[PDB]
Amino acid sequence: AGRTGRRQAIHDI
Amino acid sequence: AAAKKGSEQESVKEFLAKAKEEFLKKWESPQNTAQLDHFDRIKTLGTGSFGRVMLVKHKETGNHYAMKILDKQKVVKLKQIEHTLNEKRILQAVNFPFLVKLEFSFKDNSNLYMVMEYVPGGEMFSHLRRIGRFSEPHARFYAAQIVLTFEYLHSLDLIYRDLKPENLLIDQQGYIQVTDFGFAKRVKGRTWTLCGTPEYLAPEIILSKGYNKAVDWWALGVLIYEMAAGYPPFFADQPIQIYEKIVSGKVRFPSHFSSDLKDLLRNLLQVDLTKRFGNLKNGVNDIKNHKWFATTDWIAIYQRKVEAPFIPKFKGPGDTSNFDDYEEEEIRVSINEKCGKEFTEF
């Protein structure tokens, strides 16, 4: 079970 | 076969030397090549934290473009600002068949704008989620284009840092176009920003270690796995659980993966940087010469001579049928200039 939709990139984290 | 591959090696070196000369000319002499009321805005093709990408139509020529709009107010964090300048300067200076072409850029009181060629076939992401997974020959065709694109970028000392299916568009010939250079950076040795997308982060990023272009080769392993399985190798509901799986040094493979594929992936998804393919004495050639790529004609791929696994349907220019729908929000330009000094170089 994991993320199936579009994934946001993180700029500082 | 041996001497054919060596000559092929010298020819790569020759190509990359010329490509660097071309890049540096544009890198040193980078602005304001259009304005907003030159375009009709049609439809939002994608949305993120800082803004959106819209299909627009140039009023004079009728040409269609993808316009990335960044809200200067939303771009408030230190590394969000620096990254935006990296993206514009890099995209104006590169030239490769699998990289999206920037046409115009400009700014107003409220926003920054980058106008790129419109690639109407949609994101690889959509196609992959719809079909489930790609067969290994299909995945390999896309992987080969990424290998060549990273060989080009890395030769220019550029790290890409956000490989994933959401950022790979399919063009009218069925080939890949990499977009979103928001995390790309010129790096002569190591860099230290904690950035990227959780599922695709190399262990050394997560562990707050100074890192180099090898993070892109790790991410290629994640991409190939996801293309061939339908899901990525480090898969959990929350980022912190993803990070624990990445650092563990463990990966499990579907039973339908070929042994050649598993061997390649074990050498890309390698936590030990002294052992990771792409990062050794022979560089990218350990990847290009791997058995899983034995059938790959690298020059034929670059020259776009290979028949693609599929061609997206197109109904005409401006067709947005291969993209998902997004909430539309009015583009409002303030009477007062916002953040003029932070974005002077843009």
Ligand SMILES: [NH3+]CCc1cccnc1
């Ligand atoms: N993450 C890809 C966003 C996008 C969509 C359409 C055109 N260019 C970029």
